């Protein structure tokens, strides 16, 4: 695995026409998957991280937007990163996106972290674009290698014992962090239960406690659920992703929860910026926003 060569070819598109592909070899991509999978399994499923850190939400294969995020936030390892999942699907360059992220995980395994999103799941990414991209540019076997890698991604992270991070949200099943630690990998994402909820649930201001989720899976939770969770676990903030928000970040429940979404102009219903949350060493948080100029 010539890591520096792979990263170099991935970063050669930097400055060129948006949409130009990097066609790594199948062996190089498989090498990224196998080596990153080993590192994921060697680290906890519930990461314990320290600030300073930049935290990013959904990317969805918008590779040049990922490069802009790194340009603004600082390329690894000048800044430490935590991504909240959803690297693939929807966008045109899921492969470049995931390959660069896996390469940085291998290169800087103690300063660069990737959580699992609901799209790092074969049932979802078979439909939402990643299967098609793998079948067109490579083959179906490579898609299955990615699945085996994704099945080993960690599920949540706690920053300085005070910020709880996951892709989706809370679960009505979650009373103890030990319940997360007891999840064994590799695993698929079930359509019900704790792991499903961590990747799929959503906050909702119109629900008292736990409610149904219009997506047809998991649940919604209200502001009082957030407050109770934070108090029970001596936490200050939930940081999650999974929903398109206009400014790239959005608070919920008196700044006790924030949603991050990092793929600009993702939808057709509204323009949206992408945001990252910067957490300094003292846990002071701010947002860096990538906004299309018009």
């Amino acid at each position: 695995l010539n890591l520096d060569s792979i990263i170099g070819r991935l970063l050669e598109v930097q400055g060129s026409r948006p949409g130009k592909n990097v066609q790594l070899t199948e062996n190089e991509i498989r090498g990224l998957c196998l080596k990153s999978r080993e590192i994921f399994l060697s680290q906890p499923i519930l990461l314990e991280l320290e600030a300073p850190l930049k935290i990013c939400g959904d990317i969805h294969g918008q590779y040049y937007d990922l490069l802009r995020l790194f340009e603004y936030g600082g390329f690894p390892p000048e800044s430490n990163y935590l991504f909240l999942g959803d690297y693939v699907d929807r966008g045109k360059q899921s492969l470049e996106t995931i390959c660069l992220l896996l390469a940085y995980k291998i290169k800087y395994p103690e300063n660069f972290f990737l959580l699992r999103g609901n799209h790092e799941c074969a049932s979802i990414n078979r439909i939402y674009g990643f299967y098609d991209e793998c079948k067109r540019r490579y083959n179906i076997k490579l898609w299955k290698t990615f699945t085996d890698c994704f099945n080993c991604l960690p599920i949540a992270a706690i920053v300085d014992e005070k910020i709880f991070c996951c892709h989706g949200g809370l679960s009505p099943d979650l009373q103890s962090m030990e319940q997360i630690r007891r999840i064994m990998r590799p695993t698929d994402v079930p359509d019900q239960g704790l792991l499903c909820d961590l990747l799929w649930s959503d906050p909702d201001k119109d629900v008292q406690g736990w409610g149904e989720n219009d997506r047809g899976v998991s649940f919604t939770f209200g502001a009082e659920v957030v407050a109770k969770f934070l108090h029970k676990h001596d936490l200050d903030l939930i940081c999650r992703a999974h929903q398109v928000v206009e400014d790239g970040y959005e608070f919920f429940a008196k700044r006790q929860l924030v949603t991050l979404f990092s793929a600009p102009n993702y939808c057709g219903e509204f323009d949206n910026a992408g945001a990252m949350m910067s957490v300094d060493e003292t846990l002071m948080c701010s947002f860096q926003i990538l906004k299309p100029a018009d």
Partner: peptide
């Protein structure tokens, strides 16, 4: 020290970088 946000202390909460897609 509790988690805080930069606008608690007179800093900008956000910094915005506008970009041209091309």
């Amino acid at each position: 020290r509790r988690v805080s946000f930069a606008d608690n202390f007179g800093f900008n909460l956000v910094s915005v970088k506008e970009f041209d897609t091309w």
